[PDB]
Design a protein around this ligand. Sequence first.
Ligand SMILES: Nc1ncnc2c1ncn2[C@@H]1OC(COP(=O)(O)OP(=O)(O)O)=C(OP(=O)(O)OP(=O)(O)O)C1=O
Lengths: 100, 228, 217, 51, 50, 50, 50
Amino acid sequence: KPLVGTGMERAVAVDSGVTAVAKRGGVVQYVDASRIVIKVNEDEMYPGEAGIDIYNLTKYTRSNQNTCINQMPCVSLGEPVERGDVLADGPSTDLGELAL
Amino acid sequence: EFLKPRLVDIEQVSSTHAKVTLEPLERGFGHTLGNALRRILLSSMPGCAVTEVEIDGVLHEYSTKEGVQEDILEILLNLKGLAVRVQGKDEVILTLNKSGIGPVTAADITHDGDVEIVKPQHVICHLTDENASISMRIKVQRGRGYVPASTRIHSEEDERPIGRLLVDACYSPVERIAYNVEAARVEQRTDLDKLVIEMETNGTIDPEEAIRRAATILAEQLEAFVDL
Amino acid sequence: TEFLKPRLVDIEQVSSTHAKVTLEPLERGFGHTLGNALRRILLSSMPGCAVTEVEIDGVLHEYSTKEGVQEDILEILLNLKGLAVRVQGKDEVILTLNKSGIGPVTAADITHDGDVEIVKPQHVICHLTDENASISMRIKVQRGRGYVPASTRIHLVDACYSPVERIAYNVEAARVEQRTDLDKLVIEMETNGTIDPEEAIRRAATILAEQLEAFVD
Amino acid sequence: REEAVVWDILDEVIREHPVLLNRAPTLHRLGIQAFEPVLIEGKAIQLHPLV
Amino acid sequence: TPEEKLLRAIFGEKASDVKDSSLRVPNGVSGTVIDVQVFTRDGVEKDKRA
Amino acid sequence: EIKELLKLGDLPTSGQIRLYDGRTGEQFERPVTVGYMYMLKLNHLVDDKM
Amino acid sequence: QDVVLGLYYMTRDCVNAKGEGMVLTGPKEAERLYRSGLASLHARVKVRIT
Ligand SMILES: Nc1ncnc2c1ncn2[C@@H]1OC(COP(=O)(O)OP(=O)(O)O)=C(OP(=O)(O)OP(=O)(O)O)C1=O
């Protein structure tokens, strides 16, 4: 993460899909190195089906030669997240900021 | 003709920080020995960190373990920072077993008699699931300098065990050394120098023995100059 | 966890006063750890004897002129520092320079004492102009541990007690079979002739071991 | 196999055997100059700073 | 060639009808195998590891 | 605001400090600049270019 | 560049520096004066040279 930054670090990191952003806000049910489960808040939850938003993270897989693309969870178990939070950094992102 | 020094006060703060005084030094010898000791301390000091780790289910550092939020090479990176001091053994193998929704610290390793853990709070990995099982063999050995894992697979001669995660080993117990030379007054002797070496360790090696071995090395290298 | 010690200490020497000693292989960092800490002993803290103070016959001051000598008084002082004296069993000696005539006054023109040895009898001290022109003085050499200026003297010539006139060490890479990078140390040294370079290095590092005697396990 | 002895042999063939070095836009004749090779570790070419 | 056939009769090696074309790791690069995929043309029997 | 952040951290306003050559141990004349600069690795890695 | 800065720094002189005014037998003792911290690299100084 750049100690010397400009502010756009989030906007660049978030808008390219290399990270994993919260569909809906809630609390984390389970945090693996593999996946992440967010128990949806009722206000953001749809009437039928109920459900929980589950994000399966990308793990060590090949890019367009020869580099790698692997995501890491950046929330700890039982942590409140809101809509638009970063659930998992990607390559060259730390806590949702562009770290090239 | 020439006055020779000795180590006086060795004031210790944290287990990781220390300040060693060297008191009967001549003019120019504060800095002559201070640097040439800082140079030895940082580079060539014996210590032990972890060399190889076998994880139960994992086949290689680029896997995932259900129930752990750390990637395997993030867990291997946690072990590289495991500060162990072992006594009469040159290489020892530890066993780590822990399950439940708890962070697995360095106190959770099975304790051998010859083995001492310096940071029991040190984090190895976390466990997210309820009944999420983890067990590993961690192989520590004493070593000098910085030995990468890349240079370890030349001898090899059947290290085939597909689940033996080789890790990089940074064996130096010295983290940082500074030496400040200030004047010393010892009753009569117009001007002498007090040499203060200040050093940070990983806890494995104590300061006094480090300096002793630092200057021991120095005497041995000059043996090729005592004659030709 | 036993350490690397060097081998083949080839000693290429130009003249008895100059030498260049190469010694490989060293562990990494040991080129500068040993090279620097030895140059520091040689240059600054080395036992020796040179000219410390001289009383002049015709004049009491360094900023005067002497009838019969074409060298300024402070130019003769530069010649005295470059007089290479090795003294045997004496801690303080005083010499006598008796010489007159239309000749340059060399160091062979000094009285030859039993305990005093002049390294350069050919060495030029000063010149003498026409006629006889009388000059004779007593010159006192002193022991020291390094180089003591006249500025630091409070109770005068600069005193170069260390026999080193110049020391440099060059660290180049060394290869030992499957040992990518080691240090090959090249020491090059000039003496004033009193002690020869080879023995100077030996006594240089012995001093260093003595300081470490209170530490060797 | 890169046996240890081939390295010591490579120094033998390398000694009085100059090599040519050439940089991209070869403008004048100095763009190709011959140097005596020094066996170095790593994948980089080491270039004398004055040339 | 003549001489190569004399070499075949001395050390008695059944000269192969087949040539070595294995995929081998490029020289200089080194790492860990982390995946194998096998795509077999429809009709060929899926081999053991496949 | 940059010099004022350095004061808050007990660091010199000049952003320069006195440095020491770890080889000879002797100090460096003049104060050199030290500080933290974000630095990238560009994918022109030599073991590709060689 | 890196080198001409070095020589320009050597062959330079400042008004009042450590060693100002002493007289040295030769260039060798002039390097001895600098590496011992006694004389400054830039101080007006008469030296016997050939
Ligand atoms: N004689 C040369 N001197 C210095 N540099 C050279 C030379 N030749 C090629 N390059 C570099 O090698 C590639 C292009 O090689 P080629 O033109 O496609 O030809 P061939 O495929 O046969 O190698 C570029 O480097 P890069 O790809 O890194 O990008 P760059 O041009 O901006 O430096 C070139 O500079």
